[PDB]
């Protein structure tokens, strides 16, 4: 097949599937257990219980298959056909389909534009309804109760038909002429204004015309025949021991059959109305509970307060079918176990237990044993591997050799949660994991468990070596930084090596080379921290890419000379002359990769680990109770602050200070005293070690163990030390957030009961926040992947200069992130010129790798227009150019790489490191750095004082330093005090900004969820719509009035505002579009409409990056940009162009409008529509994909009435049917296959 379609089921098409009619609600005999005739399990209707065997047993073999034994009417075939054979029940009275009635957009409801309540009333047999009135006192549709209908029949015995119940609704749907009605609503939309005439009309017309397009008929809303599910789909299989196990579907079907049969019997029995109406309602209830139970009454299974699961419940939800079965399954050839360290492994291998290897590779072992004549047949090899014969072990070695296996950590936040390794057979039942990869998995050896998967096909074995290999993925996709970095013991050993202390044994001597340094230490003659200077030969390739070695003597240590032996050839040895902790083991690795490449860097990291582990081992590096040295001053400092609070106590007891004043006073003084104590111990630690240089005292950085661990970055930081050896600050409640009685004690002295109890308060919120956040972060990342999947790199180049302007984030005094980091890896939109205008620093469009970044960094440049994903001339995907570069590999992004999923992962993985609540704590401007004042967009004037004053609300304060870059950005309100002006020269901090004080979310992870959902803020700010002086309204009627006053042409626009909302805009001043008349938090829709696509795509990224910047999280703006692009994919036309208020996809509007604009015809104008992630994901071409993610019932119902069609054109729908996803390798295959199709 190549597509899937969904449409209404006509009664005849329903009977088509059925192979028999169910007449009796019986399942099996109760003594023979055989399927009764016409029962739900009937072998005549569906098929035989046993394979190739007849129920009566007369026909038994493959000799005769196609025959229907006259004995029992059974045809001998494969029993699995009971999985595919459907049936049908003939409903005595019509019964409506619940989905077409109870779903939010009631099909029958606005199909006849009748209200839902009245249809529900008619179905309960509580009133009548007219149909096909013709020439009647009444309409064609109406409602009347018992007395009303009583005397109504005598008026017109004919030409007046009024039914009651489901038959009435069906007949109303049948004689209904859709074209006739439709052909009127059109005009009702044209002449009459007053959108109430346009609220449901513009949607009802859509429903009508789509109903006609699908070809299905409305009368099929009411089910005439009820289809049944095959028996094997709802088995009664014996549960052993003894008791049987059935499906609730069986109970529901039994009820339906009982009620239909009783209705038939009563019909023949000629019973009065009340009885038969109660029976009709019972039948409707049973049918609706069988289809979608819970919408009406939640029928229950016997012997339980638990409701019986219906059909619809077996599809929707995280449990059920779609999420739990089709998108994810339990898989063969897999295992699980506890992971542990083996450092002896290479980065590309991992230790795998032999017991697990035997079971996993069982088929391979069987085949290999049978190949070499070691086993006669397959059974013999089975028995051999079962017997644990020695000969098989070698065979195992043969089959595991060069066969990658996928290792997976239980939680999978990003793609690095799964990586392939080369199996290394080991004894025991524990799995050995490589340390360098633990950072990628986010896995400790505290008992965590990991799973293993064995690739089956040759293609999977290649994908586990070229794509998912441990060595082919080093640097993260979210940010260029490498995720493979020495963690705790490696950096500690390296920091111990590179450390230096004066007067070490042999200090100042000279050595021939590093080999002699090693020979000197290992012999006990020279130490490892001596300040010795030796000769080293460093390699530098220069001037044509030709390696040239360099020999010289340097100022170094013995340990650094020993460490130089591991460094690859191409590095400069300036990387090895420092303290050598973790933070720049990272940068050493990064530079090694971006200079020498992948192959040298892999073995470089392996050697770093191999050496650091052994050196940290032989260094000792222990921790004792004396290692934590408390400052002797601490006593006095604590006593001083403790006394300081007594003055405040006397202050409040009198009334000189309020309660809040005194509380803030006490808290401030205690915080300052804590600062003092921590500073005392830190000054006694960092410079603690003092020894004699050449025979005389001198103080140097300390060798204290815990302090070395802090300084190297291997483990706990300074905040840990402050509590280890000093007063551990003051705690915080769940809210109230700080207590006045701090913790005087440090962990070493020991806590008393009260302070420990106080600490548990803050301890709980910390523990609890992690647990419940785990649930919500999954939801966030899941919505993210849902809104992004089908977006794949599909084109080489789009050919647009649009891009976005990349400028450094210079907030306040200094920069939060330089421009190199926000530009590197991307492509220029237009030729950057040297600061001297009209030149060329970079061509039109090129990938800016580190070299262009350095070139830009040297020249004075903080202005680079970078092409972005949001603005791109590509349809149904993104082109490699505008997206830019990124991967574990640092080249331009490949084609066919699905970037939406990896971006959702890049945003979801850090989502677990965020928090649920923020609870922040914390006026002329002072410029810090020497430079030149540069004002931006300011109108000013001179007054009495003679200096300059600002007349405009918006006024940016930049600084053009001696270089020409802008490191200062400050906003100054209306009526400031300008000391210099625009383009002046400031001293080292001259104050040029002065004004007056007055004239007069959560946030965190929930915040990120709010920004990606485009949720309206609590008290929104409103925005001006066009330039011009503002104008006021009539008076305060309800809220207030505000009249827009455009300057030149069309000036009728208007709006209404509450007088309770304060105002900020100037009265008689010109104010351009997108200005803040009112202070407040802005909304994405308003920014998009009043500023443009790029302004809003910059606002989203800049705001969602603050919460991730608060926490130590770094992700390139590219993924957030792709998400933002996916959000605004919808738009609404204005002028209706050449062909048909509507909302459609932007790409389709372009394919329809720009191609015709070329054809010289009229252009169509659209309006960007901004949607949240979940809302943008709600709208998708593929109905299968949408029905999988959320709201299965509604999506399926709507796609059913629409007769919509799905060619699957995408990822999720392809995994649902188990096909090659259209990306990566799947992209390469689909390209060739689709090229030959439809052409």
């Amino acid at each position: 097949f190549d597509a899937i379609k969904i449409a209404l089921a006509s009664p005849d098409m329903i009977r088509s599937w059925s192979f028999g009619e169910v007449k009796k609600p019986e399942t099996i005999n109760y003594r023979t257990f055989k399927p009764e005739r016409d029962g739900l399990f009937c072998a005549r209707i569906f098929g035989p219980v046993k394979d190739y065997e007849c129920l009566c047993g007369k026909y038994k073999r493959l000799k005769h298959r196609g025959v229907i034994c006259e004995k029992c009417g059974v045809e001998v075939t494969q029993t699995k056909v009971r999985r595919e054979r459907m049936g049908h029940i003939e409903l005595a009275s019509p019964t409506a389909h619940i989905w077409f009635l109870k779903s939010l957009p009631s099909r029958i409801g606005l199909l006849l534009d009748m209200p839902l309540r009245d249809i529900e009333r008619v179905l309960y047999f509580e009133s009548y309804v007219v149909i096909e009135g013709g020439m009647t006192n009444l309409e064609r549709q109406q409602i009347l109760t018992e007395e009303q209908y009583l005397d109504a029949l005598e008026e017109f015995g004919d030409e007046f038909d009024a039914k009651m119940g489901a038959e009435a609704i069906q007949a109303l749907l049948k004689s209904m002429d859709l074209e006739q009605e439709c052909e009127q609503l059109r005009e009702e939309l044209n002449e009459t204004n007053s959108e109430t005439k346009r609220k449901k009309l513009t949607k009802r017309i859509k429903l009508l015309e789509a109903f006609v397009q699908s070809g299905n008929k409305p009368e099929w809303m009411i089910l005439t025949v009820l289809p049944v599910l095959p028996p094997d789909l709802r088995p009664l299989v014996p549960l052993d021991g003894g008791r049987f196990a059935t499906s609730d579907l069986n109970d529901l079907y039994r009820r339906v059959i009982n009620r239909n049969n009783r209705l038939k019997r009563l019909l023949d029995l000629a019973a009065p109305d009340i009885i038969v109406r109660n029976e009709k309602r019972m039948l409707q209830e049973a049918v609706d509970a069988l289809l979608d139970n819970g919408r009406r009454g939640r029928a229950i299974t016997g012997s339980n307060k638990r409701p019986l699961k219906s059909l619809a419940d077996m599809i929707k939800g995280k449990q059920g079918r779609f999420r739990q079965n089709l998108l994810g399954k339990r898989v063969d050839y897999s295992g699980r176990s506890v992971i542990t360290v083996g450092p002896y492994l290479r980065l590309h291998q991992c230790g795998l237990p032999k017991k697990m290897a035997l079971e996993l590779f069982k088929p391979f072992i069987y085949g290999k044993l049978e190949l070499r004549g070691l086993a006669t047949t397959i059974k013999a090899a089975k028995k051999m591997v079962e017997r644990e014969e020695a000969v098989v072990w070698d065979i195992l070695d043969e089959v595991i050799r060069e066969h990658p296996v996928l290792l997976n950590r239980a939680p999978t936040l990003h793609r690095l949660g799964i990586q392939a390794f080369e199996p290394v057979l080991i004894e025991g039942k524990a799995i050995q994991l490589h340390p360098l990869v633990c950072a990628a998995y986010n896995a400790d050896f505290d008992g965590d468990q990991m799973a293993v998967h064995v690739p089956l096909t040759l293609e999977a074995q290649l994908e586990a070596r070229a794509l998912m290999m441990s060595t082919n993925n080093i640097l993260s996709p979210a940010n260029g930084e490498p995720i493979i970095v020495p963690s705790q013991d490696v950096v500690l050993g390296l920091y111990y090596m590179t450390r230096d202390c004066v007067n070490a044994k042999g200090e100042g001597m000279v050595l021939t080379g590093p080999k002699e340094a090693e020979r000197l230490y290992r012999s006990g003659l020279a130490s490892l921290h001596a300040r010795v200077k030796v000769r080293i030969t460093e390699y530098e390739k220069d001037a044509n890419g030709e390696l040239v070695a360099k020999t010289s003597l340097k100022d170094t240590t013995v340990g650094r000379a020993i460490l130089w032996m591991i460094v690859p050839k191409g590095l400069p040895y300036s990387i090895v002359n420092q303290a050598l902790g973790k933070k720049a083991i990272s940068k050493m690795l990064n530079t090694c990769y971006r200079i020498l490449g992948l192959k040298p860097t892999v073995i470089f990291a392996d050697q770093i680990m191999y050496t650091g582990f052994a050196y940290a081992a032989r260094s000792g590096a222990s921790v004792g109770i004396d290692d934590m040295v408390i400052p002797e001053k601490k006593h006095e400092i604590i006593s001083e602050a403790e006394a300081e609070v007594a003055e405040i106590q006397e202050q409040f007891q009198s009334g000189l200070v309020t309660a809040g004043e005194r509380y803030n006073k006490v808290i401030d003084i205690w915080a300052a005293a804590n600062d003092r104590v921590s500073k005392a111990m830190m000054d006694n630690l960092q410079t603690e070690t003092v020894i004699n240089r050449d025979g005389q005292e001198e103080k140097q950085v300390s060798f204290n163990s815990i302090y070395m661990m802090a300084d190297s970055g291997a483990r706990g930081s300074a905040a840990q030390i402050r509590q280890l050896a000093g007063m551990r600050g003051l705690m915080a409640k769940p809210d109230g957030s700080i207590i006045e009685t701090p913790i005087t004690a440090n962990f070493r002295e020991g806590l008393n009961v009260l302070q420990y109890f106080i600490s548990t308060h803050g301890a709980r919120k910390g523990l609890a926040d992690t647990a419940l956040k785990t649930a919500n972060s999954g939801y966030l990342t899941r919505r993210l992947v849902d809104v992004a999947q089908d977006l794949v790199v599909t084109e080489d180049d789009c050919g647009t200069h649009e891009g976005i302007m990349m400028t450094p984030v210079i907030e306040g005094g200094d920069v939060k992130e330089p421009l190199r980091d926000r530009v590197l890896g991307r492509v220029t939109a237009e030729d950057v010129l040297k600061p001297g205008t009209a030149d060329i620093l970079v061509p039109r469009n090129t990938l800016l790798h580190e070299q262009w970044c350095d070139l830009l960094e040297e020249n004075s440049v903080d202005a680079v227009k970078v092409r972005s994903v949001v603005s791109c001339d590509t349809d149904f995907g993104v082109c490699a150019h505008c997206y830019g570069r990124d991967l574990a590999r640092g080249h331009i992004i490949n084609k066919g790489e699905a970037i939406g999923v990896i971006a959702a992962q890049s945003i979801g993985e850090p989502g677990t490191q965020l928090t649920m609540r923020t609870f922040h704590i914390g006026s002329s401007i002072q410029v810090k750095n020497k430079g030149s004042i540069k004002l931006s967009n300011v109108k000013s004037v001179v007054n009495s004082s003679g200096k300059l004053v600002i007349t405009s609300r918006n006024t940016e304060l930049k600084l053009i330093d001696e270089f020409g870059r802008t490191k200062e950005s400050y906003k100054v309100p209306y009526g400031a005090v300008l000391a210099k002006g625009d383009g002046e020269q400031v001293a080292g901090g001259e104050t040029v900004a002065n004004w007056d004080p007055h004239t007069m979310i959560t946030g965190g992870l929930p915040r990120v969820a709010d920004l990606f959902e485009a949720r309206r803020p609590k008290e929104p700010a409103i925005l001006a719509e066009i330039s011009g002086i503002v104008s006021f309204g009539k008076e305060t009627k309800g809220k207030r009035r505000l009249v827009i006053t455009p300057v030149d042409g069309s000036d009728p626009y208007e709006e209404m505002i509450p007088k309770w909302r304060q105002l900020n805009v100037f009265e008689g001043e010109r104010v351009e579009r997108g200005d803040v008349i009112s202070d407040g938090p802005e909304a994405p829709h308003d920014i998009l409409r009043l500023r443009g696509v790029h302004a809003v795509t910059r606002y989203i990224v800049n705001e969602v990056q603050d919460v991730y910047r608060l926490q130590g999280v770094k992700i390139n703006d590219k993924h957030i940009e792709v998400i933002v692009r996916q959000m605004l994919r919808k738009a609404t036309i204005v002028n209706a162009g050449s062909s048909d208020g509507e909302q459609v996809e932007y790409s389709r509007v372009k394919i329809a409008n720009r191609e015709l604009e070329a054809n010289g015809k009229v252009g169509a104008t659209y309006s960007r529509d901004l949607l949240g992630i979940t809302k943008a994901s709600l709208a998708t071409e593929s109905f299968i994909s949408a029905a999988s993610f959320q709201e299965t019932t509604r999506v399926l119902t709507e796609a059913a009435v629409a007769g919509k069609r799905d060619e699957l054109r995408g990822l999720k729908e392809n995994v649902i049917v188990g096909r090659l996803i259209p990306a990566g390798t799947g992209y390469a295959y689909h390209q060739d296959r689709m090229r030959r199709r439809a052409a």
């Binding site: 905040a719 600050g729 803050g762 910390g766 926040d769 928090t915 130590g1112």
Partner: peptide, 17 residues
């Protein structure tokens, strides 16, 4: 310095003060 949240550092409460 980083929402922890057990003790404050500069702007918010933190896991380590």
């Amino acid at each position: 310095g980083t929402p922890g949240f057990q003790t404050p550092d500069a702007r918010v409460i933190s896991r380590f003060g």
